[PDB]
Write a protein that holds these residues in place. Structure first.
Motif, short mmCIF file in Angstrom:
data_model
loop_
_atom_site.label_atom_id
_atom_site.label_comp_id
_atom_site.label_asym_id
_atom_site.label_seq_id
_atom_site.Cartn_x
_atom_site.Cartn_y
_atom_site.Cartn_z
N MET A 105 -40.99 63.11 28.35
CA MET A 105 -40.58 62.53 29.62
C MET A 105 -39.36 63.25 30.19
O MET A 105 -39.31 63.58 31.37
N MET A 125 -39.11 65.07 33.78
CA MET A 125 -38.07 64.72 34.76
C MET A 125 -37.23 65.94 35.15
O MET A 125 -36.96 66.17 36.33
N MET A 140 -42.38 60.52 38.63
CA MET A 140 -42.48 59.07 38.39
C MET A 140 -43.03 58.28 39.56
O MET A 140 -43.15 57.05 39.47
CU CU1 Z 1 -39.58 59.68 34.05
#
Ligand code: CU1
Ligand code: CU1
Ligand code: CU1
Ligand code: CU1
Ligand code: CU1
Ligand code: CU1
Ligand code: CU1
Ligand code: CU1
Ligand code: CU1
Length: 468
Positions: free
Chosen positions: A335, A339, A347
């Protein structure tokens, strides 16, 4: 100037009652750049193998790659011995033959590799084919049925490429966490093709052949899609929808109206899954252009299609719990990588055994349990405690969904299925296995997000005997 939609060849048995499939490497072109690609009877994708209910066929499979592979018939109810899971190795330069005795309703199924730890890479390189099962009942319905004209397969897949033009596949911490996804959409292997369709009704056999990407089909001018079939065959009646979500490995057949002098596009709408609404998929994205033509068509949209049997009584059935999990450290790092590269839009809306079922990573030599033969079972599959999408698939069976991720299934999802949504909640399915599967050729049950499967989220199970 759009290229025409490629049409897979419809392949039937020869005078020896055989069908030949060769697995090999070739080359394809994407946007003026050459890439090494793999195919069945060709350089990319594969043919559509045509089968009749109640008839036996023999398939001769020649592996002309330099690495091992296997060939699984996703959607087809066959014995473990010919199911082609991870234990069905075909040596490089070798040949394996299987006899398929088809005994299920008409449906659109498909086939692909199942090599242990490498399934995502082998599908990304290009290996996928189709199966068209017919029976007496569907041929009486006067559906559109001119292959490649008004009855057309639509295999939708994303890939990413490196600057040298090659397919860019890496099983790393980010992809093992969220899946392999790309920025280029293909339709039967081509980028934004056009299909010439007769005025009247057009039948599309939709397959989401992506490794990890969920899709949601609609039309450019909002004309409706009429769902006539799911994974395992015809619904009782057509179901009219304005949009159609399709998970990895799922098939739906739809009818769409084609009217004179009005071209429109099949599109996919943005989905809420982590990583999958990055540009260019942050907006509706075209899949193919439909171009009306004035040649003859006879197909229609029937009032009734078939009949579903009643769901059996639930009292007394064996319940099996399957708890899905991901290593907290894998989720963390993957993750974070996602990001850092792509920001908030990602997201919008040792990890090789990090993913597990009932606290266990796939063991090819130890099946987790033995299921009954010929008896209904209730399997309860949970993604509670995890945020990722798990389209959960069970070999050896077409099932009925009782509860899908917190709710009863939508009407077009309430018939025969081989996949169910699990995403932060719990689903419940009613299954029955008609054929044997021994320890040496066990059935698989797994998430069809291929990177998760390859890093442990799969179990083997046997089917042996029933009531005694
Ligand atoms: Cu995220
Ligand atoms: Cu599959
Ligand atoms: Cu399967
Ligand atoms: Cu293995
Ligand atoms: Cu770490
Ligand atoms: Cu953490
Ligand atoms: Cu996760
Ligand atoms: Cu059987
Ligand atoms: Cu599988």
């Amino acid at each position: 100037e759009r290229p025409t939609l490629p049409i897979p060849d419809l392949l039937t048995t020869d005078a020896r009652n055989r069908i030949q499939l060769t697995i090999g490497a070739g080359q394809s072109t994407f946007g003026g750049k050459t890439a090494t690609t793999w195919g069945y009877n060709g350089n990319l994708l594969g043919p559509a193998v045509k089968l009749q209910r109640g008839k036996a066929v023999t398939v001769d499979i020649y592996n002309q790659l330099t690495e091992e592979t296997t060939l699984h018939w996703h959607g087809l109810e066959v014995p473990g011995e010919v199911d082609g899971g991870p234990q069905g190795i075909i040596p490089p330069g070798g040949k394996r033959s299987v006899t398929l005795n088809v005994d299920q309703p008409a449906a659109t199924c498909w086939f692909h590799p199942h090599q242990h730890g490498k399934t995502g890479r082998q599908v990304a390189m290009g290996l996928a084919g189709l199966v068209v099962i017919e029976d007496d009942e569907i041929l009486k319905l006067m559906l559109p049925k001119q292959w490649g004209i008004d009855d057309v397969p639509v295999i939708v897949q994303d890939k990413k490429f490196s600057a040298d033009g090659q397919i860019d596949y890496q099983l790393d911490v980010m992809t093992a966490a969220v899946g392999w996804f790309g920025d280029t959409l293909l339709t039967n292997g081509a980028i934004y093709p056009q299909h010439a369709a007769p005025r009247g009704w057009l039948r599309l056999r939709l397959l989401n052949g992506c490794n990890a990407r969920s899709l949601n089909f609609a039309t450019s001018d909002n004309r409706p899609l009429y769902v006539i079939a799911s994974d395992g065959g015809l619904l009782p009646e057509p179901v009219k929808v304005s949009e159609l979500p399709v998970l990895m490995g799922e098939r739906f057949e739809v009818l769409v109206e084609v009217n004179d002098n009005k071209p429109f596009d099949l599109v996919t709408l943005p989905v809420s899954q982590m990583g999958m609404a990055i540009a260019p998929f942050d907006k509706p994205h075209p899949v193919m252009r439909i171009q009306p033509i004035a040649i003859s068509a006879s197909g229609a949209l029937p009032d009734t299609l078939s009949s579903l049997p009643a769901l059996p009584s639930l009292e007394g059935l064996t319940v099996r719990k399957l708890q899905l999990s991901m290593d907290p450290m894998l989720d963390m790092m993957g993750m974070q990588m996602l990001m850092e590269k792509y920001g908030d839009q990602a997201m919008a809306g040792d990890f090789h055994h990090a993913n597990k079922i009932n606290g266990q990573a796939f063991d090819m030599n130890k099946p987790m349990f033995a299921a009954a033969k010929g008896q209904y079972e209730r399997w309860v599959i949970s993604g509670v405690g995890d945020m990722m999408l798990h389209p959960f698939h069970i070999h050896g069976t077409q099932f009925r969904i009782l509860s899908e991720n917190g709710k009863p299934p939508a009407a077009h999802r309430a018939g025969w299925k081989d996949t169910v949504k699990v995403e932060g909640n719990v689903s419940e399915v009613l299954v029955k296995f008609n054929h044997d599967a021994p320890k040496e050729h066990a059935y698989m049950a797994h998430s069809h997000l291929l990177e998760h499967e390859d890093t442990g989220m799969m179990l083997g199970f046997t089917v042996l005997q029933g009531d005694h």
